[PDB]
Amino acid sequence: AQNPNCNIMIFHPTKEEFNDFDKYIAYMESQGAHRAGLAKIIPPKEWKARETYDNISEILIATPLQQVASGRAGVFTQYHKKKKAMTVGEYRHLANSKKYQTPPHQNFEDLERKYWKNRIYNSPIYGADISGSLFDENTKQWNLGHLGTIQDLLEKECGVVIEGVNTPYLYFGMWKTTFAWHTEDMDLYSINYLHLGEPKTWYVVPPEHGQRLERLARELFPGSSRGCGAFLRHKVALISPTVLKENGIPFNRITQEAGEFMVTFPYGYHAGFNHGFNCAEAINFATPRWIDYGKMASQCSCGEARVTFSMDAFVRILQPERYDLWKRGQD
Ligand SMILES: O=C(O)CNC(=O)C(=O)O
Ligand SMILES: [Mg+2]
Ligand code: NI
Ligand SMILES: [Zn+2]
């Protein structure tokens, strides 16, 4: 079996290998990349997402989210407080202000220490989940706005045409902005490109061990767990690497830098944080290997998770027994 220890793999495709997205994902999996839950892809040196980032300041962040923590330094939840709209230019200035800027540090490791020590005592503001793209229309390879849609993949595998569309999202981050432990909707893949700015550190649990994370989470967030049998779908819980190691949870970590892609694999739990002002673009996607995961994906029906229009059809076709209850939680 390839990659039996479930290590995060890093790939360096040539320009020729960068032409066919589906084929390259399948190549990665042939080498066992999916066992880790997350892979890094460094694009060929000839490639670029767009010419420059000099003209992005007028993008609007309609609902910036202040991420307020509760709990202890290594075991906490976060809620999102809505703030007034601001432009990317305004947000970048805020990120760089003395209140929010990245502290002095020696290296990524020192910064990770400082994150886990001090995250809970600050409430950074995240410009997340903004529909849009920063890829130039003329970028033909690994353009996240031109991938094959999940609806077309389900149609090609299963024969049923469904409604829905699939478009990318922009994330403008600052120091300590945080993504809580989650898998993707319907245990989809995701792909994330860091367009500009400071790094993003990721933590991931191998898919074959995801239930171990779920069991620990039920123990560490006992009220949440009573409220919902799939409360990690709420995307609010954080558990530090120190806590995971103490509880024997298998995981890995990696830092993504500007110009690099990350791919998360079906049922690969992941969490992380931003080092300073940055902008990432991400989208979900599917392959034939996803279908079986989609069929088995847990769902939140307590009402909290509230998701896109396009998840309806996935639940309806792949999980017809669940559909009625899940839709009650949507409505
Ligand atoms: O970048 C972030 O805040 C979160 N991204 C993801 O969880 C992803 O790309 O799957
Ligand atoms: Mg602009
Ligand atoms: Ni994700
Ligand atoms: Zn729920």
UniProtKB/Swiss-Prot annotation:
Residues 8-50 form the JmjN domain. The modification PolyADP-ribosyl glutamic acid is found at E16, E17. 2-oxoglutarate binds at Y126, N192, K200, K235. It catalyses: N(6),N(6),N(6)-trimethyl-L-lysyl(9)-[histone H3] + 2 2-oxoglutarate + 2 O2 = N(6)-methyl-L-lysyl(9)-[histone H3] + 2 formaldehyde + 2 succinate + 2 CO2. Zn(2+) binds at C228, H234, C300, C302. Transmembrane segments: none annotated. Its cofactor is Fe(2+). One of its GO terms (molecular function) is damaged DNA binding. Its main location: nucleus. Ubiquitinated via 'Lys-63'-linked ubiquitin chains. Deubiquitinated by USP14 with the help of TRIM14 leading to stabilization. It is found in: Nucleus. Histone demethylase that specifically demethylates 'Lys-9' of histone H3, thereby playing a central role in histone code. Does not demethylate histone H3 'Lys-4', H3 'Lys-27', H3 'Lys-36' nor H4 'Lys-20'. Demethylates both di- and trimethylated H3 'Lys-9' residue, while it has no activity on monomethylated residues. Demethylation of Lys residue generates formaldehyde and succinate. This is Lysine-specific demethylase 4D. The chain holds residues 11 to 341 of 523 of the full protein.
